[PDB]
Amino acid sequence: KRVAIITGAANGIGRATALEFAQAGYHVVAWDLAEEAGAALIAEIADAGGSADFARVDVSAAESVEAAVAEIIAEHGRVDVLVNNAGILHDGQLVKVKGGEVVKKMAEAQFDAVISVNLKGVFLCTQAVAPHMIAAKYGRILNASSVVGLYGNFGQTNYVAAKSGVIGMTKVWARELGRYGITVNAIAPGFIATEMVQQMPERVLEAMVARTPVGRIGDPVDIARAYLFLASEESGFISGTTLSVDGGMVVGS
Amino acid sequence: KRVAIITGAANGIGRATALEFAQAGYHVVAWDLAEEAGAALIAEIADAGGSADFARVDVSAAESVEAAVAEIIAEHGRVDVLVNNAGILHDGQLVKVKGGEVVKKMAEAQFDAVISVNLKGVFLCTQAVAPHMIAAKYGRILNASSVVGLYGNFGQTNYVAAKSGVIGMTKVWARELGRYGITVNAIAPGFIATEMVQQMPERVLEAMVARTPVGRIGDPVDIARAYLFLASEESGFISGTTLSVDGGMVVGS
Amino acid sequence: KRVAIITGAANGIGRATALEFAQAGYHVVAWDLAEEAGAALIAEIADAGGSADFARVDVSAAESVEAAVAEIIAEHGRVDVLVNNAGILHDGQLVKVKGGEVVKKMAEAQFDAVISVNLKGVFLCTQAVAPHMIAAKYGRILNASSVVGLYGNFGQTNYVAAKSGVIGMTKVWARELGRYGITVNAIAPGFIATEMVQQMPERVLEAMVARTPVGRIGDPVDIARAYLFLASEESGFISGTTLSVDGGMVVGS
Amino acid sequence: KRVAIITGAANGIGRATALEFAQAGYHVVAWDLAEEAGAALIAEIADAGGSADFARVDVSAAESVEAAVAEIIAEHGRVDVLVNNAGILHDGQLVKVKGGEVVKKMAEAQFDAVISVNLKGVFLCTQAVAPHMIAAKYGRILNASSVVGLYGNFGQTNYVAAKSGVIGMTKVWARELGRYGITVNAIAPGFIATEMVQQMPERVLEAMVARTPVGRIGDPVDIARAYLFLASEESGFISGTTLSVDGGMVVGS
Numbered sequence A, B, C, D: 001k002r003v004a005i006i007t008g009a010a011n012g013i014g015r016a017t018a019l020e021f022a023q024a025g026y027h028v029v030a031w032d033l034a035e036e037a038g039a040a041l042i043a044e045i046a047d048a049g050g051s052a053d054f055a056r057v058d059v060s061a062a063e064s065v066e067a068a069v070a071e072i073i074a075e076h077g078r079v080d081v082l083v084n085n086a087g088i089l090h091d092g093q094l095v096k097v098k099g100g101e102v103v104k105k106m107a108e109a110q111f112d113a114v115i116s117v118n119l120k121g122v123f124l125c126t127q128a129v130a131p132h133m134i135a136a137k138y139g140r141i142l143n144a145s146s147v148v149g150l151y152g153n154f155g156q157t158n159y160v161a162a163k164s165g166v167i168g169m170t171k172v173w174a175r176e177l178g179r180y181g182i183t184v185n186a187i188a189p190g191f192i193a194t195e196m197v198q199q200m201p202e203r204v205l206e207a208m209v210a211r212t213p214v215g216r217i218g219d220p221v222d223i224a225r226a227y228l229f230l231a232s233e234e235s236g237f238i239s240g241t242t243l244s245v246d247g248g249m250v251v252g253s
């Protein structure tokens, strides 16, 4: 069993990814802040007869991430795959104006928070697993971007900055780590039925479907399967790329 | 069985993709100009326990394409998949000057021939199977682009025009056909050792590999499995995209 | 006097560009199929104290292009700038299915004619001018692409193929011709108020503006001033790029 | 006189941009940390008969930025243009290895410092001028990206993240601000002859020119001119775009 670390595993796309990798025979190491959801995931994988650990790790805390990787290596001796999927949102206009003045603007903290998890988290986790991958002459680095990182989107300064930034780091690490048997790719999901989207008002959802050529909101499973494909020992000639899984949706103006 | 049309099936990437889809349990229809190699493909397929047909088809000839699609429908009733992989190269600088005179230039015919096969052939083939995919409310269209369609390349005015335009058409068709259960994607391969590439000077291949982060020339098999994955019934939320399989290679200037 | 060839000069963007370049002090050579509007353009340029010639040229016809470049060399001894702006539209769905049958489809000739003018024509004009730019060790090649070359669009298989493909050739030629003092660039306009556009249903034009961030249809002079800038002898470090002038409009799906 | 804020104005591209805007008749407010160099710039602009102020502003510090904008509005009543050109570099591999042993890795504070100036600072500055531009129904936001944000680059994890992220933020702001007469664009310079590049070894510089189609390193004035064009009151239909000024250079792997 190859070992795969999936961050943000306790919910949504990471939950699906975690499940898919386990069913495929990976030993899954699941990272998240959400401990109850974490244990629930493990219960789900045990019910499906898979092999996996859960660990409470903050991807944006260097000391937390370093300690987590050391424990994996001491227990299992290898990290084959890292999926950097942990994320957060705090949308809002740069400045929101009505009646001759600013009624709201994106809080400096809201900006910093989203960058810390969605950009800096990717850097920390990858930096931490890389030396092991190099020594093993193998690895798979898989980074969560977004369709929104390609086109931009209203109200998503911080989130777009992070997710376009993640594609950039993916291109760098592709170049640096190839010569060591490591590939580095990103995935850019469209609208996916995780909890945020499933809570959207009725009119907004059906417009989102109408704007999507294939005719639906995507499922976490769609992305999980995409990560599994990219992680294959047979996907050694795929590196430095961004695979869109967005039902053909392009974010109009 | 699901039916997959693979154009340019007789050699290289087409041949591997044909062998690959039939092994996965598709019924393959192989189209190519090269009858001898086409027949041998079918033989190899049938010996391995697969099912396939070959037909001599010039993808650039509308009448040829239309008849061949009608034959398939008459025999098998369906077209689940089309891989538009057939292509040719005829490289050359736009213009080559010396002694104050043009001494060589990309001939009109050689511009036209690459356009005809690599661009127009993709249009004709897709256009012919499209109505059958619509009625069945299911389809997979898969188009052969190139890394060089992304970045451009010295000496390839014609090939790059075709391969960049193929991505354009991929985006249109995704828009037009998604409503009918059809996805439309492209693959853009990097350096892949087909016949011609295998016969390139050792020194040149070495420099090509040196420019490739994962550290080798690619194999037809790398591409074959990429189409297979995009062609999956479980890959229905991937559409309008360009999947790069280039080992991380970026064509620098 | 620097000499600038403007193709499709009789109307729309081309007409504004010729007026613009002549006002800046270029000697303009206007190429178009439409002599009536062509000859009037020159009259107006002359009225304003500028310098310009008109020639009836089919940019898709190699002989007619070659002869016309020769005539310019014989008269003026030089070509400093070529603006490949000549274009045509013939839209339509790839196929249109009803009653279980194809009731309309993009005709082979529709596809071909747009490719011929919008892609081939750019190749022929650039090929014919290039040796003179090479001898002079100076040149500016400027290619008409479209916002729709970046994102694709419903109903535009042919137009998108050609415009995405024009960007591809722009990248090749930049690579081939830079060492001779020549830059090669493209512009991708959004919604611009030329003939057909100005005649579109008010309600449709209103929808198009609503999709445009800066809140209006563009004007041909928006484009003409962008070519002039790229054409500048002080724009010699811009090459291989695609300048978008689209008011921030992104063609949603 | 329109008012333009140029950040990182004391050296390199910022200095040339400040001089170019002054010569165009803008009142320039130059921002930088480098005070002596700040005074010298003002003295240069005075010698050329222009109008300009210098202020010591750390773009990464919210309090400093908002105090600086408030002083501009109190003194001049308007901010027409912001060029966010300030930047820093701290290069190095994610993980540097020899002997299957890690000899260096990108320090966390190294990652954080570059993100702080090159990404967050852009967000702070724009956010600080934007309400005034909205009130006035006019504005030009112009963000410094890099060719490296397009293709990635060995040893530039932190810098590429920032510069690719800046492009993302550019796309968000285009969407949000267009309705108020405000445009938002990025420029992506190639290799430009500022101090760092100028200090490069002979052999590395040679190869850099060799790999640049137009045959030289760019000059800061190349980029100054491009910012000026994009900031023109006649460039109101240019928004949401990234103009490359890189001499046709594409960063090979």
Ligand SMILES: NC(=O)c1ccc[n+]([C@@H]2O[C@H](COP(=O)([O-])OP(=O)(O)OC[C@H]3O[C@@H](n4cnc5c(N)ncnc54)[C@H](O)[C@@H]3O)[C@@H](O)[C@H]2O)c1
Binding pocket: A007, A008, A009, A010, A011, A012, A013, A014, A031, A032, A033, A034, A057, A058, A059, A060, A085, A086, A087, A088, A117, A118, A121, A144, A145, A146, A147, A148, A163, A188, A189, A190, A191, A192, A193, A194, A195, A197
């Ligand atoms: N779902 C979408 O609509 C969508 C769209 C586009 C792109 N994406 C990408 O897919 C990724 C996951 O999206 P999602 O929809 O499943 O969201 P999600 O909320 O369902 O899951 C995020 C998980 O990450 C965890 N998490 C958060 N912060 C963390 C930290 N600092 N350390 C560790 N763990 C942490 C959360 O607790 C949560 O379980 C995102 O990073 C995003 O970039 C999603």
Ligand SMILES: NC(=O)c1ccc[n+]([C@@H]2O[C@H](COP(=O)([O-])OP(=O)(O)OC[C@H]3O[C@@H](n4cnc5c(N)ncnc54)[C@H](O)[C@@H]3O)[C@@H](O)[C@H]2O)c1
Binding pocket: B007, B008, B009, B010, B011, B012, B013, B014, B031, B032, B033, B034, B057, B058, B059, B060, B085, B086, B087, B088, B117, B118, B121, B144, B145, B146, B147, B188, B189, B190, B191, B192, B193, B194, B195, B197
């Ligand atoms: N192999 C590479 O290095 C590489 C790289 C980048 C892109 N590609 C591409 O992927 C595709 C396959 O490349 P390949 O390397 O396998 O080339 P290939 O020469 O090995 O195979 C091409 C096949 O298409 C057939 N063919 C040609 N013209 C035709 C026509 N008019 N009608 C029908 N059939 C026809 C040929 O007979 C041949 O069997 C190509 O179209 C090309 O666009 C290849």
Ligand SMILES: NC(=O)c1ccc[n+]([C@@H]2O[C@H](COP(=O)([O-])OP(=O)(O)OC[C@H]3O[C@@H](n4cnc5c(N)ncnc54)[C@H](O)[C@@H]3O)[C@@H](O)[C@H]2O)c1
Binding pocket: C007, C008, C009, C010, C011, C012, C013, C014, C031, C032, C033, C034, C057, C058, C059, C060, C085, C086, C087, C088, C117, C118, C144, C145, C146, C147, C188, C189, C190, C191, C192, C193, C194, C195, C197
């Ligand atoms: N105007 C737009 O809305 C728009 C938008 C996006 C991209 N473009 C591109 O910019 C260019 C100009 O578009 P436009 O709106 O000004 O359209 P237009 O119809 O007003 O002008 C087209 C001109 O090209 C000429 N022309 C056509 N065919 C020719 C041939 N074979 N030889 C010579 N000359 C020829 C026509 O006579 C006409 O004068 C087009 O090539 C188009 O691809 C335009």
Ligand SMILES: NC(=O)c1ccc[n+]([C@@H]2O[C@H](COP(=O)([O-])OP(=O)(O)OC[C@H]3O[C@@H](n4cnc5c(N)ncnc54)[C@H](O)[C@@H]3O)[C@@H](O)[C@H]2O)c1
Binding pocket: D007, D008, D009, D010, D011, D012, D013, D014, D031, D032, D033, D034, D057, D058, D059, D060, D084, D085, D086, D087, D088, D117, D144, D145, D146, D147, D188, D189, D190, D191, D192, D193, D194, D195, D197
């Ligand atoms: N010149 C090149 O080779 C090149 C190539 C690509 C992109 N760029 C980009 O264009 C921009 C300019 O590059 P340059 O080469 O001209 O750089 P430079 O180092 O010459 O100048 C950068 C300026 O920013 C100032 N600065 C730094 N931190 C600051 C802070 N926190 N607050 C305020 N001011 C601060 C510096 O003192 C300096 O004057 C950069 O942002 C860079 O991203 C440059």
